Design a protein around this motif. Sequence first.
Motif, PDB file in Angstrom:
ATOM      1  N   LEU B 510      -2.497 -47.028  12.324  1.00 60.54           N
ATOM      2  CA  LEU B 510      -2.845 -47.645  13.595  1.00 60.54           C
ATOM      3  C   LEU B 510      -4.345 -47.551  13.833  1.00 60.54           C
ATOM      4  CD1 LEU B 510       0.057 -46.549  15.974  1.00 60.54           C
ATOM      5  CD2 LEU B 510      -0.239 -48.668  14.683  1.00 60.54           C
ATOM      6  N   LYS B 511      -4.894 -48.567  14.496  1.00 57.42           N
ATOM      7  CA  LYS B 511      -6.326 -48.649  14.750  1.00 57.42           C
ATOM      8  C   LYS B 511      -6.657 -47.904  16.037  1.00 57.42           C
ATOM      9  CE  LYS B 511      -6.029 -52.999  13.731  1.00 57.42           C
ATOM     10  NZ  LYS B 511      -6.183 -54.274  14.483  1.00 57.42           N
ATOM     11  N   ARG B 512      -7.438 -46.834  15.916  1.00 55.81           N
ATOM     12  CA  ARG B 512      -7.805 -46.036  17.076  1.00 55.81           C
ATOM     13  C   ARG B 512      -8.794 -46.785  17.962  1.00 55.81           C
ATOM     14  NH1 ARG B 512      -7.498 -40.422  16.146  1.00 55.81           N
ATOM     15  NH2 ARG B 512      -7.914 -40.534  18.393  1.00 55.81           N
ATOM     16  N   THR B 513      -8.564 -46.716  19.271  1.00 53.66           N
ATOM     17  CA  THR B 513      -9.472 -47.272  20.264  1.00 53.66           C
ATOM     18  C   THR B 513      -9.451 -46.369  21.488  1.00 53.66           C
ATOM     19  OG1 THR B 513      -8.606 -49.406  19.497  1.00 53.66           O
ATOM     20  CG2 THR B 513     -10.291 -49.453  21.213  1.00 53.66           C
ATOM     21  N   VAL B 514     -10.542 -46.399  22.259  1.00 52.79           N
ATOM     22  CA  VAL B 514     -10.677 -45.486  23.392  1.00 52.79           C
ATOM     23  C   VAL B 514      -9.554 -45.705  24.400  1.00 52.79           C
ATOM     24  CG1 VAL B 514     -13.133 -45.079  23.103  1.00 52.79           C
ATOM     25  CG2 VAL B 514     -12.368 -47.085  24.358  1.00 52.79           C
ATOM     26  N   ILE B 598      11.163 -45.731   7.687  1.00 54.39           N
ATOM     27  CA  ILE B 598       9.924 -46.410   7.325  1.00 54.39           C
ATOM     28  C   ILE B 598       9.962 -47.869   7.754  1.00 54.39           C
ATOM     29  CG2 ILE B 598       8.362 -46.977   5.433  1.00 54.39           C
ATOM     30  CD1 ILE B 598       8.256 -44.122   5.802  1.00 54.39           C
ATOM     31  N   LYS B 599      11.130 -48.512   7.696  1.00 57.23           N
ATOM     32  CA  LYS B 599      11.238 -49.876   8.202  1.00 57.23           C
ATOM     33  C   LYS B 599      10.922 -49.929   9.693  1.00 57.23           C
ATOM     34  CE  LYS B 599      13.505 -51.832   5.465  1.00 57.23           C
ATOM     35  NZ  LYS B 599      13.414 -52.442   4.111  1.00 57.23           N
ATOM     36  N   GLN B 600      11.474 -48.986  10.460  1.00 52.39           N
ATOM     37  CA  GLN B 600      11.175 -48.937  11.889  1.00 52.39           C
ATOM     38  C   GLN B 600       9.694 -48.664  12.134  1.00 52.39           C
ATOM     39  OE1 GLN B 600      12.980 -46.294  15.514  1.00 52.39           O
ATOM     40  NE2 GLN B 600      11.905 -45.212  13.869  1.00 52.39           N
ATOM     41  N   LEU B 601       9.104 -47.760  11.346  1.00 53.35           N
ATOM     42  CA  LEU B 601       7.684 -47.453  11.492  1.00 53.35           C
ATOM     43  C   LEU B 601       6.824 -48.675  11.198  1.00 53.35           C
ATOM     44  CD1 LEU B 601       7.225 -43.836  10.068  1.00 53.35           C
ATOM     45  CD2 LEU B 601       7.765 -44.603  12.380  1.00 53.35           C
ATOM     46  N   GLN B 602       7.181 -49.437  10.165  1.00 48.82           N
ATOM     47  CA  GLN B 602       6.467 -50.673   9.868  1.00 48.82           C
ATOM     48  C   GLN B 602       6.603 -51.664  11.014  1.00 48.82           C
ATOM     49  OE1 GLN B 602       8.063 -51.645   5.954  1.00 48.82           O
ATOM     50  NE2 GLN B 602       6.002 -51.616   5.067  1.00 48.82           N
ATOM     51  N   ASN B 603       7.791 -51.739  11.617  1.00 47.63           N
ATOM     52  CA  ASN B 603       7.986 -52.637  12.751  1.00 47.63           C
ATOM     53  C   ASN B 603       7.071 -52.266  13.914  1.00 47.63           C
ATOM     54  OD1 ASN B 603      10.440 -54.613  12.316  1.00 47.63           O
ATOM     55  ND2 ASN B 603      11.026 -52.668  11.358  1.00 47.63           N
ATOM     56  N   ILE B 604       7.019 -50.978  14.267  1.00 47.21           N
ATOM     57  CA  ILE B 604       6.179 -50.598  15.403  1.00 47.21           C
ATOM     58  C   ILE B 604       4.707 -50.769  15.061  1.00 47.21           C
ATOM     59  CG2 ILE B 604       7.577 -49.166  16.918  1.00 47.21           C
ATOM     60  CD1 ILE B 604       6.981 -46.796  15.177  1.00 47.21           C
ATOM     61  N   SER B 605       4.320 -50.510  13.808  1.00 46.12           N
ATOM     62  CA  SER B 605       2.931 -50.722  13.413  1.00 46.12           C
ATOM     63  C   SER B 605       2.543 -52.190  13.531  1.00 46.12           C
ATOM     64  CB  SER B 605       2.707 -50.223  11.987  1.00 46.12           C
ATOM     65  OG  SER B 605       1.481 -50.707  11.468  1.00 46.12           O
ATOM     66  N   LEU B 606       3.418 -53.093  13.083  1.00 43.19           N
ATOM     67  CA  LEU B 606       3.142 -54.519  13.219  1.00 43.19           C
ATOM     68  C   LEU B 606       3.062 -54.923  14.685  1.00 43.19           C
ATOM     69  CD1 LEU B 606       4.701 -57.208  10.908  1.00 43.19           C
ATOM     70  CD2 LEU B 606       4.208 -57.724  13.295  1.00 43.19           C
ATOM     71  N   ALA B 607       3.964 -54.392  15.515  1.00 45.23           N
ATOM     72  CA  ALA B 607       3.933 -54.717  16.938  1.00 45.23           C
ATOM     73  C   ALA B 607       2.638 -54.242  17.585  1.00 45.23           C
ATOM     74  CB  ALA B 607       5.143 -54.105  17.642  1.00 45.23           C
ATOM     75  N   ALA B 608       2.195 -53.029  17.248  1.00 43.80           N
ATOM     76  CA  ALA B 608       0.944 -52.515  17.794  1.00 43.80           C
ATOM     77  C   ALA B 608      -0.247 -53.334  17.316  1.00 43.80           C
ATOM     78  CB  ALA B 608       0.772 -51.045  17.417  1.00 43.80           C
ATOM     79  N   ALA B 609      -0.246 -53.731  16.042  1.00 47.88           N
ATOM     80  CA  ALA B 609      -1.336 -54.550  15.522  1.00 47.88           C
ATOM     81  C   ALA B 609      -1.393 -55.903  16.219  1.00 47.88           C
ATOM     82  CB  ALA B 609      -1.184 -54.730  14.013  1.00 47.88           C
ATOM     83  N   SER B 610      -0.231 -56.513  16.470  1.00 49.37           N
ATOM     84  CA  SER B 610      -0.206 -57.811  17.136  1.00 49.37           C
ATOM     85  C   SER B 610      -0.770 -57.723  18.549  1.00 49.37           C
ATOM     86  CB  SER B 610       1.221 -58.358  17.162  1.00 49.37           C
ATOM     87  OG  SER B 610       1.264 -59.641  17.760  1.00 49.37           O
ATOM     88  N   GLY B 611      -0.409 -56.678  19.288  1.00 51.72           N
ATOM     89  CA  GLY B 611      -0.879 -56.523  20.649  1.00 51.72           C
ATOM     90  C   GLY B 611      -1.592 -55.211  20.899  1.00 51.72           C
TER      91      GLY B 611
END
Lengths: 717, 757, 482
Positions: B510-514, B598-611
Motif C-alpha cells: 500500500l502507498k503511504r500518505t499523510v 492472499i486473494k482477499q489481501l489482493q482484493n483490498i490492495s486493489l480497492a485501496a489503490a483504486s481509491g
Amino acid sequence: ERSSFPRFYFVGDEDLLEIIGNSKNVAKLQKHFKKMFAGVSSIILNEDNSVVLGISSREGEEVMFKTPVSITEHPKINEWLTLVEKEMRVTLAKLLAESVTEVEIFGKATSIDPNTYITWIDKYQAQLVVLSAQIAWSENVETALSSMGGGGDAAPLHSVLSNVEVTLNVLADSVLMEQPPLRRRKLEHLITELVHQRDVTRSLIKSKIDNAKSFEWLSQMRFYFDPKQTDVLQQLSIQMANAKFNYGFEYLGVQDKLVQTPLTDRCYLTMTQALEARLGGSPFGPAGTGKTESVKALGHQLGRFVLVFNCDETFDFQAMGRIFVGLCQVGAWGCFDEFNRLEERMLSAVSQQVQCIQEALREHSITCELLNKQVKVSPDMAIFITMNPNLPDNLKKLFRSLAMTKPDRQLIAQVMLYSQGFRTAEVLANKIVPFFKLCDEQLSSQSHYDFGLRALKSVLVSAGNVKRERIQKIKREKEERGEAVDEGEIAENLPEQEILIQSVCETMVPKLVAEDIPLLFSLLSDVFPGVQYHRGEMTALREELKKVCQEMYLTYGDGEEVGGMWVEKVLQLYQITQINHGLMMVGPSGSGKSMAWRVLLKALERLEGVEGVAHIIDPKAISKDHLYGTLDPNTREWTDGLFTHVLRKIIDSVRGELQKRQWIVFDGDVDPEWVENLNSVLDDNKLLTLPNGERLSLPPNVRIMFEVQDLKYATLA
Amino acid sequence: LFQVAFNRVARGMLHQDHITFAMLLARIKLKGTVGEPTYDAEFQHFLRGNEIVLSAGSTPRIQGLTVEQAEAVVRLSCLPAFKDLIAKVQADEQFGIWLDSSSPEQTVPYLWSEETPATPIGQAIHRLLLIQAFRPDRLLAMAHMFVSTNLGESFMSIMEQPLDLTHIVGTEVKPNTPVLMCSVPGYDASGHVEDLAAEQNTQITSIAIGSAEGFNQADKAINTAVKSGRWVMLKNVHLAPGWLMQLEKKLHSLQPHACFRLFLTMEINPKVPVNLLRAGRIFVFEPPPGVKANMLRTFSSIPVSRICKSPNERARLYFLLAWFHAIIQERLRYAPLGWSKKYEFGESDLRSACDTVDTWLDDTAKGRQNISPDKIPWSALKTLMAQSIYGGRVDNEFDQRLLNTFLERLFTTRSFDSEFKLACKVDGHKDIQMPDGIRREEFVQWVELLPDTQTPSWLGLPNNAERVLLTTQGVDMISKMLKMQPAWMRTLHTTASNWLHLIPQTLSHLKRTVENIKDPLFRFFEREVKMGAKLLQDVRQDLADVVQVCEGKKKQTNYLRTLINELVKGILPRSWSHYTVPAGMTVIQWVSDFSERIKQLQNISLAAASGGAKELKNIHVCLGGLFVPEAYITATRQYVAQANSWSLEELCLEVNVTTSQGATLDACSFGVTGLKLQGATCNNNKLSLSNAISTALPLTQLRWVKQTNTEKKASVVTLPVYLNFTRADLIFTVDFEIATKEDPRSFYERGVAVLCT
Amino acid sequence: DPGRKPLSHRFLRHVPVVYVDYPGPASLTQIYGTFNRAMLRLIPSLRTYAEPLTAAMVEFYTMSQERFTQDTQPHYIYSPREMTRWVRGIFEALRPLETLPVEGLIRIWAHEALRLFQDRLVEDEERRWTDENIDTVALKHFPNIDREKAMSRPILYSNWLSKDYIPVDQEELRDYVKARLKVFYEEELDVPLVLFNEVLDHVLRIDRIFRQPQGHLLLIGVSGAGKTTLSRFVAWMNGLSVYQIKVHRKYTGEDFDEDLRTVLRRSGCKNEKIAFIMDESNVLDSGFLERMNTLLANGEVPGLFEGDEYATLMTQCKEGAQKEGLMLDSHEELYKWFTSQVIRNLHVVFTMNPSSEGLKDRAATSPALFNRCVLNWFGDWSTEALYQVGKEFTSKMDLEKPNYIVPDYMPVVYDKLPQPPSHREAIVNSCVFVHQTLHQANARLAKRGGRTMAITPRHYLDFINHYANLFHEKRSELEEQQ
Ligand SMILES: Nc1ncnc2c1ncn2[C@@H]1O[C@H](COP(=O)(O)OP(=O)(O)OP(=O)(O)O)[C@@H](O)[C@H]1O
Ligand SMILES: Nc1ncnc2c1ncn2[C@@H]1O[C@H](COP(=O)(O)OP(=O)(O)O)[C@@H](O)[C@H]1O
Ligand SMILES: Nc1ncnc2c1ncn2[C@@H]1O[C@H](COP(=O)(O)OP(=O)(O)O)[C@@H](O)[C@H]1O
C-alpha cells in the motif's frame, strides 16, 4: 544453634558462620536481618549497643519496643533474637489495640477533623492504620447487620456508608496538599482500603442483606478483634468464608497495596478455601497479571512474611532446600515464581520436595523428613506455585488452581487515580486503560517498549506527582498575586485530562522511535479528544544549550530547524533527570547520547550555578567483582570497586561535591550480571549494598545514567 | 491367527482405535485371499478423497444435498464406477428418506453402476464409499459392519465383554513379562487386579511409588517375590521414568518363578519409557462413556456412611452434586461444543465439592435431623462451586458463565419438589424426572433404572452433538489409516509444483500518505498487507528452493532439510505459521486457506489503490481471512471515533445481520462476511434455537453507537465469537436478541457461538 | 570467515577499516617475477626464461583460483601463500644442483605444481583437469621444449637414491622402498605392504612435508587406506620417532595436556625429533582442536606450562642449552630457544576421515588447522591399487588352471589387464569387480535414502584373507581324499 530460632534458616550457611563469628557485634547483623525479615532493615539500638530499643524499615519508619530486651542479660544470639521476635509481636499487637481504639473513637462520627485524623495516621505505622481501619469498618458493619437482624428493620448501614464516604472525602482533601512521602504512602493505602470498603458496603446495600450469617456478608473479609484475650498473638482473628486465620503480627514496613479488584477477591477466596482444606493453590496464567503479588497481598493482609523464589537460571537448590525447611519451621509463606521455566530435573526435584511438605501439611489436619531431618510442620505454613501456561503430576491432586486470565485494569486505574486526589477518576481510568490496550497492539513492536500494568501504575503515579507540582506552583503564584489560598478552589478549576496527557507524553514519548510519535499522538486524539498538551519550553535552558553548543562547536536548532530533534531529545533527557534518579539513553551508535548528556550537564552548570562532575565508567571493560568491590576471604576487608569508590568519595563530601551535581554515566553495554546489584539503587529506596555488609545512601544530586547501544539482553525488570 | 492378533492387540489399545486396527486386519485379509480383486483404486479414493481439489462451478447444487454433500458426491463421482451416481441421485425418490435415516448403513441403497455382480466384500466397500460421502457420522458403524462382513460378525465380540484378566495373568503371559495397566486420567485399574488376587487366593504386595523409600520397598518386594513366586503391585509407576528404565533393565536379566507376576498400574503420558512399553503386555482401561455409569462410579467412590448423616436432606444434596459432576464430565467429551477446551474436571473436584457441602451443611444444620429446604445455604454452594472449585480451571469467561448457569439451574430451593426437571425435552416432549426419595438407596435405584439411551439432550447439548463427535471420530479413523500406509522425491516435486501453480504470485503493498497515515483503517490494512506480503514471499522462495532441490540443482541445507522432512511427514512447517491456526490443520488445507487469504489481501490492495480510505471503509472483509481480526474491529472502532470525535470507551458494538444485497452502508456500519452461527439460526436479528449444526450468516454489519447507559433487556444474549472451530481464541462478543418463548439459559447450555471460519 | 565474530558497531565507529584483497594478476606477475629473477640468478644459462616462467606460474594460479572455487570444497582456497611456497620449493630444488637444461626446470615446475594445486583435490576429474592445465600452460608459454622429457607422467622426486633432490624413476624408487620395507619388516611391524604407485606418491609427499621445518600435515582419506601406517613408515625412514596419544573414554583434557607437555619437552629440550600422530577418534573434545591449532600456529601453547611444570621445563631447557653449548640465564631467552627447538623438531601429522560437511565443521572451529597445514587426499585404493593387492595377496596358492578358456567378451574392469587373462589375473580382476560392485551398491542404497556403511580397503583385506583360509582348508581336505 540452627534448630533454635529457625529464622536464620534462610540466610546462607557461610552467612551463618559469619553471624556466628560476628556474634559479639550487633552493628554487622543488619544484612541478615534484612534477609530473614519482611521489611525490617535494622534494629534501633542505644549508643552502648547493649539493649535494642526497637526496629526500623528500609523506608525509615521505626517501631518502639514497649519493654526493650537487653542483650547483656541474654548473651546467646538465638535467645535474644527470639526475645526480639516475641517483643516485636507483642508491641505490634499493643499498638494495633491502641490504633483500633483510636479509630473507633473517630469512628461512628458525623464529621471528621482532618487534624486529628492526620495525627492518628502519623502516630501509627501504615500496616497498623490499614488494619485498624479494616477492623473498625468490619465491626461497624457486623453491628449494623445485627441491628438489621430483626427482619426488614431500619437501616443503619447507610450511616456506615456515609461515615466511610466522609472519611474518603477527608482523605482525598488531605492527599491533595503537600505531605511527607511516608505519610503520603500511608494516605494512599488508607484511601484504597476505604474505597474497597465503600464498594463492598454499596454492594451489601444493593443486595438488601439482613442477616449477619448470610453468605453474601460471609464472602467478604471480616476482621474480628478481641482485646479481652490474654494471648496477644491470637487477639486478631481474620476470617473469610469458612476459613479463619490468625494475624501473623510481623512487621511489613511499607508495602504497595493491591486495589482489591473482583478477580483479586476471587483469588483471595480460592486461596483461603484451599488453605482451609489444608492444600496450596496454583494461580496459573500469563505473565503480567499479578499472580505472585496477589499471593503476596494475601500473605501481607494475614501478616505473614512471604518468600518470592524467582525461578530462572539464578535458581539454586541447597540454598533452596535450607530456606524451604526454614519456611516449614517458622510457618511463613513461600510463593514460587514461574514454575514452568525450571529444568525438568530441577522441576521434578522441587516437585517431590513440595509434594512431601504438602503431604505433611495434610497429615497435620506432625513432622516431615527434610534433608534427613524431621521438621515439625507449622499449621500457618503455606506454599503457592504459579505457572505460565502444567502442574507436575505428583502435585495435581495436591494443589488447587485459579485462572489469572486478565486483571481488571479499569478498576485498578480508577482506584489508583482516586488515591492520587484526581477528580472524575472513573472517566480518566476508563479512557486510559483502553489507551494502553491500543498502545500494546497498534504501535510498532520494540524490545524496550513496555505497555504492561506496571507501566500504567507508574504513569498514574507520575501523573499524580505532576498534579501536585502544578497545584504547588499555582499556590506559589497565588501567594505572589493576591492572598486567597484554597486548595479545592484551584482543584476543581484545574483541568485533569491535560495532566494525564502531559504525564503520558513526558514518560512515554521518549521511549518512542522516530515513527511511533505520530501514532501516539493519534491515539491520544482518539481516546482523549479535543484536549492537547504543549510542553512548557524552558527558555533559559534553551539559551544555555545554544551557548554551550556554540562553545563546543555543536549545531543547534529549534523544532523543524536542523538539530531540532536532538534538542527535543536533550530536553526530554532533562525532564527525565528531573523526575527520575536513574536513566538509560538507548539508541544506535552515532545517535549522539554522550555529548547530549554532556551539553545538558554544562548548560545546567552554567544556568543553575551548580558545578557538574561526571564519572564515565565502562561496566564490561572491568570485571563485575572489580566494578563493585572484592571480598577478602579471611579479613573481610573492603576493597571498594570503581563504582563503589566513586559513590563513597561523593558521599564523604570532602570537597563539597554534594553541592555539585554528580552524573555517573555508565557508557557501555548492559547485561543482567552487574546491574543486579544496581537494581536496589534504581528503585525508590536509593540504597546501595556491599558484599561486606555496608550500605550507602545515594545523595539526591547523584543521577545514575546508562549510555547503552541496544537492549537485546537487558531484563525488563 | 487373525482373531487372536486382534484380541491381543486391542486389549492394550484405546477404544477409538479398535476399529482402526480391525480395518487394518481386514485389508490384510482382503489382500490375502485370491478370489476378490485388489480394490486398490477404491481404497485409494476412500483414504484420499478430501485432497482432491474442486471449484465453485463444479458443484451443481443438487436439491436435497448440502454444500459439503455436493462436494463429496461429485468427488465420489470422479471415479469411473460411480460416474452415473448423480443421475440416480436426481432420479431416485427414496433417497430423501434414507439420507436422514437413523441408521442408513443398514439399508444402503444400490447406486454404484457395474457390468457384473460384485462380491459381498465389494458391495461392502462400495457402501463404505457411499456412507463416507453422504453420512460420515455413521462411518464408524459402517466400518464395524464392513469388518464384520469381511472377517465375521463376531470378530469384535470379545471387546465388548469385560476383561477376562484371570486367563491372561494365569497363562499366555510369561512371568518375566510385566503386566502393564495404562489407564486414562480419572481412573484406577487396581480394583480389578486386587479382586483377581482375592479370587485366586494369591497374596500380593501393594506398594505405591512416591519417593526413594517407595523405590526401596518395591525393590525388596520384587526380590522376595521373584524367588517366592508371589505377585507384586505398583501404583502410579509413571512418576519416575528413569527408575522405570532401571526396573526394565533389572527385569531383563532375571529369571522369575513360574507363579511370579509383576503388575504396574500406570498413567498414559509420553514420559513413560518406550523400552518397558515394548517389553511388557499393556492393558488400557477407560471409564464407560455414560451419565449413568458416571453416577454409579461416583456413588461407589463416596462411602455410604458419609452420605447418610444427621440431615436427611444431605442425601438429596449429594445426589444433586453427583448429577452436576457427571453432567459436566460427560459434556467434556464434546470439546468444541460442551466447552471451549478440555478441562481437567477430575475426582479431586468431586472430593472438594463433597467436603464443601459437608462443612456447610454442618454449619447451617447444627445436628438437626431435618432442615427446611429454604434454610440450605444455596448461595454458599453456588458461589463456591462457581468460583473456587470447578471454576479455578475455567479461564474463558464464557465457560464460567455456562458453569454459573448450570449451578443456578440445579442448586436451588426449587430442586426439592417432586416436579423438578434435571433436563428439558431430552427426546420430543419427554423430560427427565428428579427422584422423590430422601434416602441414598432410592437415588441409587433411580440411577440404576435410567433409560440407558443417553442422548446429548440429556446433558444440555442438542441431539446433533453426537453426530459431530461421530464425524470427528470417523475423520480420525481416516487419518490414522492413511498414516498407516526415491519416489517420494517425485511426489514432493509434483505437490510443490501444484502449490506454486495454486498460490498467487505476488501481492502489492500500500502507498503511504499523510492522510492515509492519519486514518486508522489504512494503518491496520497496511500492516496486514506487509505481513501477508512477507509471508507470501517467504513461502514462494521456500517452495522454489524445494522444487529446485527436487531436480537436484541444489543441495539440502539443514533448515531446508527440516523443511522437506516436515513437508513429507505432512506436519505444518513452523517457519510458515505466523498467524493463529487450528492445531490439527495439515499443510494442504493450510495452503488453501493461505490462497484465500492472499486473494482477499489482493482484493483490498486493489480497492485501496483504486481509491483511498473512504473506499477502504466499505469493504466487506471476512474476519477469518484477516490475520488478526480483533485488530480490524479495533480499527473500525477508532475510525468511527475519529469520524464523530467520540471517546473510544463510550462506544458499544451493535450487530444487524442482514442479507448481502439488502444491506445499508451507513457511515458507522462495516460489512463483515463469512461469519457462521453454531447451534442457532438468525432471522431479522432474532435468534432461534435449531438442530442445524451451523447456519451461515449472509452479511454481518458492525455498527458502533454511543453507550446509552441503559440496562440490557432480558431478551438479549451475549454470544462469543471464535476465530476457528476449536474455539481456542476469542475475537469479540456480540449482543443478539433472542426470539420469544426462548430461554437464554438454554442458549447458554447449548454452546451457541459465532465462528469466523 | 569461520571462528570470527563481527565487532561492535560502537568499536567500528572509531577504527576505519581498509580491505587488503589478494594481489592482482599483474601485481602477482611483478611480485613473483622479482623473486624468480632473484632465484634464476643461481644458474646463468636459463636467466632468459625467468619472465615467461613467472607468466606461466601466474596464469596457472589464476586459472586454478577461477576454477576451484571455495563453494565446492571448503579447502579450495589459493592465496599468494601458495605461490610463495611454490617459488621457495623451486629454489630449494635448484639450490644444490649447479647446472640444468630447461627441461629439468620445467619438470621441477610441474612437480611443484602437482604437489601444491593438485595434491589437495578430492575428485579424480579435478586432478585430470589440473594435469591437462599444466600440460597446456607448459606448451603455450614454453613451446620450444621436448614434451615427453619435460613432463613425463611419473613425476617422482626424492633425495633417498642420490645426494640431491633429483627426479627418481618409479621403478628404482619401488625397489629401494621394497628394501627399506624389508628392513622395516625385520625390525618394526611385519605386516604386508604392497607398493602401488599411490603409495610411492604418498610416501614422497609425506617425506617432503616431514623434511621441511614446522611441517604439519593434514591426512584426509578413507579409513583403512594406510594413512597412519604410511606415516609411521616415513617417520622411521626419516629417522623421526612416531608418537600417537592413546585415547579412551576416561581420557579427558588433563591427560591430553600431560601428553602435550611430555611431547613438547621431548621435542624441545632433548633435541629429539618427534612425529605426532593424531586421529579424529583421538579428538574427543573441541578443546583438543583449539589447543592443536594454537600449537601449530604460534609453535608453543602458553596454556601447557605453568607453576611447577614451568620450573621443571626451565630446568630441562637450561640443561639442554648447557649440553648444546648455549649460555642462557633468564627464563625468556630459554623459553624462546625451547620454542625454536620445538618448531624445528615437532612435526604433527593428523588424519581425518573423509566427510565434506565435516570439513566445514572442523575448519569452522579450527582456523589454523585448515590454514597452516598441508592437506593431502589419500583417497581410496584405486582400481590399479586394488588389482595389485589382489595379485600380490593371491599369490601363494595355485590359482592356475590350464583348462581355462579366454572368453570372447571380458568386462575388462582392470584397464591394464593382459588380453589373454590368465586364471589368476582373471580371478583377481573378478575380486576387484566385487569390491567395485559393493561400492556401487552402497552408493545406490545412499541414493534411496537407506542407511549405508562405508566400504573401506580393510574390507578388501579381510575378503582376501577369508579367501585364503577357505581355499586352503577346502583344497586340503579334498586333496586328502584325492
Ligand atoms: N547536535 C549535533 N550537531 C552536530 N554534530 C553532533 C551533534 N550531536 C552529536 N554530534 C556528533 O555526532 C557524533 C556523536 O558521538 P557520540 O559519542 O555522542 O555517539 P553515540 O551514538 O552516543 O555513540 P556510542 O554508542 O559510541 O556512545 C560525534 O561525532 C559528535 O561530534
Ligand atoms: N490487583 C492488582 N492491583 C494493582 N496492581 C496490580 C494488581 N495485580 C498486578 N498489578 C501490577 O501488575 C504487575 C504484575 O507483575 P507480576 O507480579 O510480575 O505479574 P505476574 O503475576 O504475571 O508475574 C505489577 O507491577 C503490579 O504493580
Ligand atoms: N599399501 C598397503 N598395502 C598393504 N596393506 C595396507 C596398505 N595400506 C594399508 N594397509 C593395511 O591397513 C591396515 C591399517 O591401515 P591404517 O594405516 O590404519 O589406515 P588409515 O591410517 O588410513 O586409517 C594395516 O594392517 C595394513 O595392513
